[PDB]
Design a protein around this ligand. Structure first.
Ligand SMILES: Nc1nc(=O)c2ncn([C@@H]3O[C@@H]4COP(=O)(O)O[C@H]5[C@@H](O)[C@H](n6cnc7c(N)ncnc76)O[C@@H]5COP(=O)(O)O[C@@H]3[C@@H]4O)c2[nH]1
Ligand SMILES: Nc1nc(=O)c2ncn([C@@H]3O[C@@H]4COP(=O)(O)O[C@H]5[C@@H](O)[C@H](n6cnc7c(N)ncnc76)O[C@@H]5COP(=O)(O)O[C@@H]3[C@@H]4O)c2[nH]1
Ligand SMILES: CC1(C)C(=O)N(Cc2c(F)cccc2Cl)c2cc(C(=O)NCc3c(F)cc(F)cc3F)ccc21
Ligand SMILES: CC1(C)C(=O)N(Cc2c(F)cccc2Cl)c2cc(C(=O)NCc3c(F)cc(F)cc3F)ccc21
Ligand SMILES: COc1cc(C(=O)O)ccc1NCc1ccc(C2(C(C)(C)C)OCC(C)(C)CO2)cc1
Ligand SMILES: COc1cc(C(=O)O)ccc1NCc1ccc(C2(C(C)(C)C)OCC(C)(C)CO2)cc1
Lengths: 318, 318, 318, 318
């Protein structure tokens, strides 16, 4: 992540390497103990069979709830609800048959099944099926179950994908009509999600200069919708050092406000996590987007003193 | 939901009721089988201890990966990484001590530990840790891990919270200047995420009249950012049945475009589910908000034969 | 597919159902035979271990060739070549370790390894690794490894996506300037891939009326690239019965000529299969594409006598 | 390939050489072990018989699915459906008879058959039938099952085969009417599939001069379909270094747009591989064609610092 050092990189395969090391150590331990290998295989298979039976029972319990949402969430198809509860029905059925056979055959089935059902019911009722924070985070960032992903794609599809192409023309028109504003959009990404409405409050050096020729278009039934873009001057030691089209990333305001509202269910640590994820997703979207053919420069910063003017000027002078 | 029958209601406690029934049946069958209750207790406790030890080993494997992101995602504290990977360290440690004691005391040990490690490593390496679709959906909808959650909270915080209060004044000004527009903003919510750029194309029975007095504000560094609303005409047999400020919910455009990009990682079933969730979340927010003093009327619909103009007219006739 | 009855539908899960039935029958047979279940498990695990070792050997043989394309096909990364040859290195390594351990432990290893390597070398050298036609077809249609897929996504992204949106304007201009041509593009899809240059040669009834106002645009360094579209009159029993913008699907000409050329390596049975696949892919692309908002009507037909004029007229009058 | 070093050469016989080495080593170690050769022969034959029986069972499972598409994909002949699943019926039957005989004759049987069926059903249901990436790639590039194969052949049959012959005449006419354009069409092949809509944007050193006399013909119902080529000017230090008929290979636009659509099922590594394959296929077809009498010069390049104008100039100076 070239944006900021504090942006987490995507999760790799460290867990798999640790699992391989664990498997090697366990095999070495089994070899050293010198117990009958047939017993090792028998007990491993019996353990996996018990896990499969527990999965079946937990899936039936989940089905008891999911069947209430058949007509709305699952389009009135019982097979779809069963697939949502117990994974692929065919594979799960095959594994369940194998588990039943090998548990009934290998050296009381009904009593062990009763105990297993009791254990699963206890796990469900006491709410012990809660995944660890790291596991939930990995699941969410692998399936794109974040608010930051949706916010970044909203900010790209709705604003950047419609503004970046014509920004060069608007800048050219402004330059001819009147002060050599840089030919790029400088988006500020405060990782603390503190986005003031007027930049001059953020830093005394930043000062409004003038607006750009407005852009117009039809959007979702609201026609003549207009996109403005203010021009600011980077005031250094009293004398202008640069001018650019500065603008905060508005989804960060939504993140902050969501963090502030109780009904949102958004915590302040969730705020930092999702702000960093938004900054990381926007970078990828722009890197793969043809519209950003050297058109914008995402600026991300953390407030520990600090001057936004210096940050923007550093990213500009380069 | 009153919005549309296809909107899924929040998950209840059906799973826990089924778990209670399963537990009662399991206890009844244990009574029927008539085996030493102490043996039942011993094997149940040993099963739970094995589950706890498996959790420990899987958490260590996850720690192997999470430790790489310490300085970025966990703020440099090893305790936070360990907590993320193994829940609460104190409770996990207590249960681990109890499990080890009761495993080594009740009627080998290192052999069972090696087999448990083998099983856990095999589960991780083979990628059998995935959760069923229903469990992932439940976790996401309980922890607010959807894209339709942040999108709804951006739509409210950023457009509606800033437009609804002044809509009465703008409509009053327009009425004085001319026109009997209804004093409410109608937001159409296509569950299929169609949302064309002009309503007339969606239905030739919907015609434009004129815009409202623009509203201007300062937002996230942009000066004089303005919001425009378009008045529309509801014909019926060619005659003006009614007039209102129609508008599409723009986040559905983002949902559609996300579903249309391979980089987004967003599917089409995902699109429908997130659209329904967005409708529900927006309904809840506007139902528990002060701004919505009967200032808006969400309209949701699904394609069948269908005429949008009749839908809006029916909602208006109330 | 509603296009033609002869368009194959996508492959389902019949193989999985047959596999489940086979597994049930085999388990019943094992139960009936009454042999020691421990022996069953031992021999099943040993068979799977032998399969894994054979996979390792075949993957090493494949690596011996793939290592020559490291700098071109695999970006100079040895790990990428190994992952391409032996699948996921970590999972394959874990399974290989387990196979070695259980084959060496459970009731000579080196002799059997030599024999297994001999068998794998014989399979490779004699060219016995040939997948059945059905398996290759399933792999290709699941991973989109067809010429028809690329041709359909070329015909949509290069021609239809730039013609359908603005076709209505050209039709309206032609109508006002001059004969009420239907407001849709009628694409003919000869499943035999026989595409003549002049329609009147295909059928005497098909007669030409006039051209449409040319469309123009800039494409890939060639500007003023024009897209003409002829209008034909449907002549029935001597008198006109309709007029439309009729046109063949030109990628079928590429399919035919490719089948004719020897350097292509394309067969006539391949020609029919790929023509059907192209017709089925274009249907989906248009089904979920916004541009085809009732803009085109794909006509697919199989020659057996036969009148193209009658087919077009049937699809028109409806 | 002479085009670019990144173009992968066709697969050779490295795998078979490695298989020969493996077979020789296995025979040497069998000699070293010095054990009954008849036992070696028996075990080898039995292993091959087990493989054949597994092939039979897997083919029957595949037949269970293929029989549903008999009338569509196999023309209603059960023999063709069986051939598609079990290779050649006669050879498979002969090998099956030999396998059954040698299994029932050499030193139970029904038990081994049931275990083999269990293993095959488990392989199918668990989805372990997938091939390694380097084997799917080999099969596709041997059987011409690539997306780029059809695109290269469409580009040849439809543009080049119809343009190259008359390019000399068109250039002669333009030269007489004015300009010293080189008598060759230069096709740029961006391996990254950039291909912007105007070369000037790609490089400001590439300026347009004028168009060529249009070419007209009849194509698939449409007639007066015109092909236009744009002459471009090759500047150097602001001075015209050369002039040529530049052009991008449009199929790369299709490859890029396919990679950008989720429905296409097309990835980005897929995009790069297919672009390289398209370049190779076009080079081969144009090197073994009569039309290309030095009438074109394919140019391939990769982004690094890099100037397109210098690349084209270097290719022109030859
Ligand atoms: N800096 C800046 N200047 C702009 O002109 C602008 N326009 C949009 N955006 C931001 O990019 C994204 C695209 O908006 P989208 O329409 O998809 O959702 C928008 C849209 O559904 C609605 N909305 C906002 N402004 C308008 C508006 N003028 N008219 C109608 N609807 C609006 O409320 C949502 C959130 O808006 P913002 O939360 O302030 O930030 C948006 C958003 O994150 C802008 N950001
Ligand atoms: N009926 C019809 N009228 C048209 O104007 C037209 N234009 C394109 N197409 C077809 O759509 C598809 C997309 O074309 P693409 O440009 O991506 O590949 C094209 C393009 O790379 C090149 N080519 C074809 N025509 C031109 C042309 N006039 N100028 C430059 N390049 C061309 O050769 C490829 C194959 O062309 P066709 O195989 O005859 O049919 C094409 C193609 O199947 C048309 N079809
Ligand atoms: C890997 C190894 C050796 C291991 O560590 N355990 C933990 C364990 C228990 F889980 C249960 C008792 C002792 C031990 Cl020691 C285990 C279990 C089985 C088994 O058959 N479990 C069925 C099963 C039960 F036994 C009790 C129950 F309430 C439900 C249930 F489904 C096989 C192999 C192992
Ligand atoms: C499922 C069942 C009972 C079965 O049907 N076979 C087929 C078969 C042979 F393949 C080989 C001999 C007899 C039978 Cl009968 C099998 C094999 C093994 C096994 O250990 N194979 C290792 C192995 C070999 F034996 C010979 C070889 F040349 C290489 C090699 F790697 C285990 C269980 C079975
Ligand atoms: C993707 O493959 C898997 C998927 C899933 C899942 O869907 O949860 C689980 C497990 C999968 N593979 C691992 C696996 C291990 C053991 C067995 C097996 C034997 C086939 C040897 C006997 O052991 C005992 C058994 C009752 C567990 C079933 O049979 C099968 C599979
Ligand atoms: C996705 O899961 C799979 C992937 C692959 C693959 O990558 O080819 C193959 C197999 C996979 N699951 C099925 C499976 C069955 C049995 C075994 C196992 C026991 C775990 C019980 C002992 O026995 C056979 C063994 C000696 C080989 C080692 O392990 C493991 C797995």
């Amino acid at each position: 992540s070239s944006l900021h050092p504090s942006i987490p990189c995507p999760r790799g395969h460290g867990a798999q390497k640790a699992a391989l090391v664990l498997l090697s150590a366990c095999l070495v331990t089994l070899w050293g103990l010198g117990e009958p290998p047939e017993h090792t295989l028998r007990y491993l298979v019996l353990h996996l069979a018990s896990l499969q039976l527990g999965l079946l029972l937990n899936g039936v319990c989940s089905l008891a709830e999911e069947l209430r949402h058949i007509h709305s969430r699952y389009r009135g198809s019982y097979w779809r609800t069963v697939r949502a509860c117990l994974g692929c029905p065919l594979r799960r059925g095959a594994l369940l048959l194998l588990s039943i056979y090998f548990y009934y055959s290998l050296p009381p089935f009904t009593w062990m099944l009763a105990l297993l059902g009791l254990s699963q019911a206890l796990n469900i009722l006491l709410g012990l099926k809660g995944l660890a924070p790291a596991e939930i985070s990995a699941v969410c960032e692998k399936g794109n179950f974040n608010v930051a992903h949706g916010l970044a794609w909203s900010y790209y599809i709705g604003y950047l994908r419609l503004i970046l192409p014509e920004l060069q023309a608007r800048i050219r028109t402004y330059n001819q009509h009147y002060g050599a504003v840089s030919q790029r959009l400088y988006i500020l990404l405060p990782l603390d999600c503190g986005v003031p409405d007027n930049l001059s409050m953020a830093d005394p050096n930043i000062r409004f200069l003038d607006k750009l020729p407005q852009q117009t278009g039809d959007r979702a039934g609201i026609k003549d919708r207009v996109y403005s873009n203010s021009i600011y001057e980077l005031l250094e030691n009293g004398q202008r050092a640069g001018t650019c089209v500065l603008e905060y990333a508005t989804p960060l305001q939504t993140l902050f406000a969501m963090s502030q509202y109780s009904q949102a269910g958004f915590s302040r640590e969730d705020r930092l996590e999702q702000a960093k994820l938004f900054c990381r997703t926007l970078e990828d979207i722009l890197a793969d987007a043809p519209e950003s053919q050297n058109n914008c420069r995402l600026i991300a910063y953390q407030e520990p003193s600090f001057s936004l003017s210096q940050e923007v000027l550093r990213h500009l002078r380069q």
